[PDB]
């Protein structure tokens, strides 16, 4: 039983403490190769990511899942470089986020399924590195193309057992329509994580998804512009709900009996060209711990609020292993 990482297959027990929704860089296809000076240089970005992953590993992280797709500018060779230098496993993704180019947008469900299967079963580009998760997105009601993408992701998952993870506009309850589409293709909800679910306080929405068997991605816990209310860019990106408000949704779903369905992350990054210039200065001021925020701050905060150690181990170790290890079911 094995999970594909950017340095090859690992056994389930090697994943350890896992961050299920992270990025080395949030960019666009071809952008890092065409304009590396945007990031200072490719080597500056790699070095920044290695320092950050090493601090995360010191705090207990063993694996991240980089849910950057083709259209997030995923560079699997960069991921393999930083994975080896930090001694942190990195799982890469296939799928499409919400910035696909025309060459993707004009494709049918069947064509997209071929593409996703290429990246899971054969490899990414000419690297032979295989994805271990499928990432998809909506930002409100699905576009016609996004519906095709979710259907293709379901077909790819149904052939390979690799799971699907999503970007939502949680405030618009996108996970409802996502689930509908996935289920119409026969996908088991145990193979799906409805992500950015901590962006909403709506427990009716969150428990309706969890009750039908979805995994719930509380993956933006450090996202907050509190203290920076006069930076419009920062507020628009991060919102004005506190990291504590977000982290308490982890406790809320535990208290409702869904501990085995929660996945927790930071949705952090080391470079970010798909937003305003100099946004990394803001992010690194907001959350200097970066990807170590979950182990260093959230885990202690939940213990202090009464969540048992055994439960926190289930969430950070066992749930990612069960979710990632390929299957048409995971329970």
Indicate which of Zn ion, its own copies, none lies near residue 167 (CB less than 5 to 8 Å, by partner kind): Zn ion
Q: E strands of 151-280, at which residues?
A: 164-167, 192-194, 215-218, 262-264
Least Å distance, CB 323 to Zn ion, is: 16
Q: How far apart are CA 160 and CA 163, in angstroms?
A: 9
Pick one of 11, 184, 242, 277: the residue that binds its own copies (CB under 8 A).
Answer: 277
Whether 72 and 27 have beta carbons less than 8 Å apart is answered as yes
Q: Does residue 89 have a known ligand-binding role?
A: no
199 binds Zn ion (CB under 5 A): no
135 binds Zn ion (CB under 5 A): no
User: For 288, which DSSP code?
Assistant: T
Closest CA to 6 of 150, 133, 105, 155: 133
User: Which residues, other chains included, contact 284 with Cβ-Cβ below 8 Å and sequence gap of 6+?
Assistant: 290
Q: How far apart are CA 259 and CA 275, in angstroms?
A: 34
204 binds its own copies (CB under 8 A): no
Indicate which of Zn ion, its own copies, none lies near residue 171 (CB less than 5 to 8 Å, by partner kind): none
Contact region for its own copies (CB under 8 A) — 109-117, 166-174, 292-300, 310-318? Answer: 109-117
Q: Does residue 21 have a known ligand-binding role?
A: yes
93 binds its own copies (CB under 8 A): no
What are 272's strand-pairing partners?
Answer: 26
Pick one of 8, 9, 40, 101: the residue that binds its own copies (CB under 8 A).
Answer: 101
Closest CA to 42 of 285, 267, 268, 273: 273
Whether 136 and 95 have beta carbons less than 8 Å apart is answered as yes
The residue sitting closest to Zn ion, measured at its beta carbon, is: 167
Q: How far apart are CA 237 and CA 281, in angstroms?
A: 14
Pick one of 11, 41, 108, 242: the residue that binds its own copies (CB under 8 A).
Answer: 108
Positions in the binding site for its own copies (CB under 8 A): 27-31, 33-35, 37-38, 70-71, 73, 99, 101-104, 106-108, 111, 114-115, 118-119, 124-126, 273-277
Chain contacts with Zn ion (rule: CB under 5 A): 167, 267
| Binding-site positions for Zn(2+) | 21, 23, 135, 167, 196, 267
């Amino acid at each position: 039983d094995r999970i594909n990482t950017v340095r090859g297959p690992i056994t389930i027990s090697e994943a350890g403490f896992t961050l299920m929704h992270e990025h080395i860089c949030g960019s666009s296809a071809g952008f890092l190769r065409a304009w590396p000076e945007f990031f200072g240089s490719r080597d500056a970005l790699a070095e920044k990511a290695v320092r950050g992953l090493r601090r995360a590993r010191a705090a207990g992280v063993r694996t991240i899942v980089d849910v950057s797709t083709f259209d997030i500018g995923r560079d699997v060779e960069l991921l393999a470089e930083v994975s080896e230098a930090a001694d942190v496993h990195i799982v890469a993704a296939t799928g499409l986020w919400f910035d696909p180019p025309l060459s993707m947008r004009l494709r049918s469900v069947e064509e997209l399924t071929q593409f996703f299967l290429r990246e899971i079963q054969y490899g990414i580009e000419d690297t032979g590195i295989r994805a271990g998760i499928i990432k998809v997105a909506t930002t409100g009601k699905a576009t016609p193309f996004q519906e095709r993408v979710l259907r293709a992701a379901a077909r790819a998952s149904l052939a390979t057992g690799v799971p699907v993870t999503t970007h939502t506009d949680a405030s618009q309850r996108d996970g409802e329509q996502q689930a509908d589409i996935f289920e119409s293709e026969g996908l088991d909800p145990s193979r799906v994580c409805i992500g950015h679910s901590d962006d909403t306080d709506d427990l009716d929405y969150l428990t309706a998804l969890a009750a039908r068997g979805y995994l719930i991605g509380l993956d933006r816990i450090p996202w907050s512009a509190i203290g920076l209310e006069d930076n419009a860019s920062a507020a628009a990106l991060l919102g004005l709900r506190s990291w504590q408000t977000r982290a308490l949704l982890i406790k809320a779903l535990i208290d409702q009996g869904y501990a085995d369905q929660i996945l927790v992350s930071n949705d952090w990054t080391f470079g970010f060209s798909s937003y305003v210039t100099n946004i990394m200065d803001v992010l690194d001021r907001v959350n200097p711990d970066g990807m170590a925020f979950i182990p260093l701050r959230v885990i202690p905060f939940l213990r202090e609020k009464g969540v048992p150690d055994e439960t926190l181990e289930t969430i950070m170790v066992d749930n990612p292993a069960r979710f990632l290890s390929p299957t048409l079911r995971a329970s």
